[PDB]
Write a protein that binds this ligand. Structure first.
Ligand SMILES: CC#Cc1cncc(-c2cc(Cl)c([C@]3(C)CC(=O)N(C)C(=N)N3)s2)c1
Length: 386
């Protein structure tokens, strides 16, 4: 229904991540924590770092418990190593509960903490299967549900500004909402449409059809989910499998053919700029991803605008952007640029993910993002990769 205490509790942006305030220890130590549906560990800076202005001080927490075990988590993004322990954790603009949770106290890291992000840790919201060192390390959300009456569901409204936010603006601006235990009806318009969670590890889904301005990409649907498709608040871009990326970029280029962009733009490396207020949104196509429905042989589609896939960046008074669709060798990743178009419901209890048009999606007077259905779709199980 209505969760006023949790609405507008996020800050950040697609390039740096969206974070929520949390407290760890007794007395409480306030930290800003990245909301990450693409991982399953609660890991916080616990030692001085040039890019951290605060960190978790275990020696100052009377409720700190040492698990006497280390963990090393290498990624292609940042690498981190930490010391496992437990402590009391709260979310000030969240449910009015305090839970005992696992915390990986980061003592060393490489390219993990980013200069100017304003976050000191990561809240991994995915399932125990992908927790490090192994699935015996109960994720935060699992602890929260076990220890309290909080329903086994959370929902995210990530709010892209539609323009660059400087260092001060990004600290003062509302970046969205994380509703823990419910669905807030003020955060979306129209209906919520649900897609099954294929398997409980990452938030895995199945894409059944892809269109660029209504034109079918016409690839075998298995290609769209090769080797998986996930919903990840911890990824900036919409990431597509190599072959899907090559077909999508060819189609987006054909649709926007009245303006030639350098190769660097399509590679997501170079920005493109237009005179203030003249961005030619109309020349770029809409993108629709059809997802498996809850009813047999039924699908629905989510449609994003270039206002979602063109990420605003500062150059001048020009309006500049980077292309926020990129290739992947690890499957489709529906990152922040996709999530900014929708209110996304992580219905863990009913093993499903809901999508509705976000009340904060950026658009123009001519087009809006959309969530529509149903469509009759056959052999959708065949779209899943094994
Ligand atoms: C939006 C946003 C963001 C954003 C900004 N800066 C750092 C990060 C992240 C750094 C690291 Cl490491 C992250 C991990 C744990 C591993 C990974 O590789 N992906 C992809 C994740 N889901 N989770 S997210 C995210």
């Amino acid at each position: 229904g209505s969760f006023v205490e949790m609405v507008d509790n996020l800050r950040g942006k697609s390039g740096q991540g969206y974070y929520v305030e949390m407290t760890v220890g007794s007395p409480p130590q306030t930290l800003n924590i990245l909301v990450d549906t693409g991982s399953s560990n609660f890991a916080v800076g616990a030692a001085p770092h040039p890019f951290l202005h605060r960190y978790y001080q275990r020696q100052l927490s009377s409720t700190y418990r040492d698990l006497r075990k280390g963990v090393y988590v290498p990624y292609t993004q940042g690498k981190w190593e930490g010391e496992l322990g437990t402590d009391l954790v709260s979310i000030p603009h969240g449910p009015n509960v305090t839970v005992r949770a696992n915390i990986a106290a980061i003592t060393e890291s490489d390219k993990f903490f980013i200069n100017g992000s304003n976050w000191e840790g990561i809240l991994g919201l995915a399932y125990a299967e992908i927790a490090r060192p192994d699935d015996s390390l109960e994720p935060f959300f699992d602890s929260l549900v076990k220890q309290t009456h909080v329903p086994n569901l959370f929902s995210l409204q990530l709010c892209g500004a539609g323009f660059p936010l400087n260092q001060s603006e990004v600290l003062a601006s509302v970046g969205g909402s994380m509703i823990i235990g419910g669905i807030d009806h003020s955060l979306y318009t129209g209906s919520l449409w649900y897609t099954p969670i294929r398997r409980e590890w990452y938030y895995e889904v199945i894409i059944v059809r892809v269109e660029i301005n209504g034109q079918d990409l016409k690839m075998d649907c298995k290609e769209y989910n090769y080797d998986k498709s996930i919903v990840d608040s911890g990824t900036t871009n919409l990431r597509l499998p190599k072959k899907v990326f090559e077909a999508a970029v060819k189609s987006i280029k054909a649709a926007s053919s009245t303006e030639k962009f350098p190769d660097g733009f399509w590679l997501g490396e170079q920005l493109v700029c237009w005179q203030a207020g003249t961005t030619p949104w109309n020349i770029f196509p809409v993108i629709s991803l059809y997802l498996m429905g809850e009813v047999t042989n039924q699908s629905f589609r989510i449609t994003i605008l270039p206002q979602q896939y063109l990420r605003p960046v500062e150059d001048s008074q020009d309006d500049c952007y980077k292309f926020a669709i990129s290739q992947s060798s690890t499957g489709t990743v529906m990152g922040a640029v996709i999530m900014e178009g929708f209110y996304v419901v992580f219905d863990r209890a009913r093993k499903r993910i809901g999508f509705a048009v976000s009340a904060c999606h950026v658009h123009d007077e001519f087009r809006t993002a959309a969530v529509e259905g149903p469509f009759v779709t056959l052999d959708m199980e065949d779209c899943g990769y094994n």
